[PDB]
């Protein structure tokens, strides 16, 4: 504690006193840094939610997060062919089952 100056964890830059920052979970984000990770929306004037060490908004928190692949990381579709194993599902192709060599 030779200086002790609240800084940002996103831009790793120092925050000013006049600059409206957001202190949460022993952290601080700039009025332009503090925002969602899915829609990238600033929760400066809107509520926010922190889950699994990740910042998100109420609009996203809801069940509006379609399934995503792990082999290609592409938006998966119900009709489309996919392979579910442990929480995550890999496209029929991405998934290499032992069904054959």
How many whole angstroms separate alpha carbon 20 and alpha carbon 29?
9
DSSP string across 25-76 = TTEEEETTT---SSS---TTSS--EEETTEEE-HHHHTT----B-SSS--B-
- CB of 42 vs Zn ion, minimal distance in Å: 10
* Residue span binding Zn ion (CB under 5 A) among the ranges 17-25, 44-52, 89-97: 89-97
* 44 is a contact residue toward Zn ion (CB under 5 A): no
Q: Within a 13 Å sphere around the CA of 21, how many CA atoms are in the beta-carbon half?
A: 21
- CB of 1 vs Zn ion, minimal distance in Å: 22
Would you give the binding string for Zn ion spanning residues 4-43, x where CB under 5 A is met? ----x-xx------------------x--x--x-xx----
* 94 is a contact residue toward Zn ion (CB under 5 A): yes
């Amino acid at each position: 504690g030779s200086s002790g100056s609240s800084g940002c964890v996103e831009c790793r830059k120092p925050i000013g006193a006049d600059s409206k920052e957001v202190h949460y979970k022993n952290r601080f984000w700039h009025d332009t840094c503090f925002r969602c990770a899915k829609c990238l929306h600033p929760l400066a004037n809107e509520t926010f939610v922190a889950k699994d060490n990740k910042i998100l908004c109420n609009k996203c928190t809801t069940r509006e997060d379609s399934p995503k692949c792990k082999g290609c990381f592409k938006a998966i579709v119900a009709g489309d062919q996919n392979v579910e194993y442990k929480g995550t599902v890999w496209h029929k192709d991405c998934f290499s089952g032992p069904s054959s060599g």
